[PDB]
């Protein structure tokens, strides 16, 4: 009924202390069957796709959220992150969100 959309706001930033837990949000909009969403981290000119991580779906009213879990948050997590969606055979990216540790 509608297009898949990733609503991370431009210039998003979260300043957190190491040793504490954190949940990084990726607002996903969908009208069909839930789309495949993934997370990456900016390292120079490429966004390094993150493997084997704790992630969760949190369904709301008009929106839904894909979350990356930092259980806990380490100092070697300071950087800018992004979520991407591959559905109709192409990759759609969101705005990058920065994490200050």
């Amino acid at each position: 009924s509608c297009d898949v959309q990733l609503y991370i706001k431009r210039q998003s930033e979260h300043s957190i202390l190491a040793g504490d837990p954190f949940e990084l949000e990726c607002p996903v909009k969908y009208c069909a069957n839930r789309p495949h969403v993934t997370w990456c981290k900016l390292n120079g000119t490429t966004c390094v796709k993150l493997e084997d991580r704790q992630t969760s779906w949190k369904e709301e009213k008009n929106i839904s959220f894909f979350i990356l879990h930092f259980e806990p948050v380490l100092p070697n997590d300071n950087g800018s992150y992004r979520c991407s969606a591959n559905f109709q055979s192409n990759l759609i990216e969101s705005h990058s969100t920065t994490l200050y540790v």
Partner: peptide
């Protein structure tokens, strides 16, 4: 120009 603040 990334004119939109929520969409990339």
């Amino acid at each position: 120009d990334y004119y939109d603040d929520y969409v990339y």
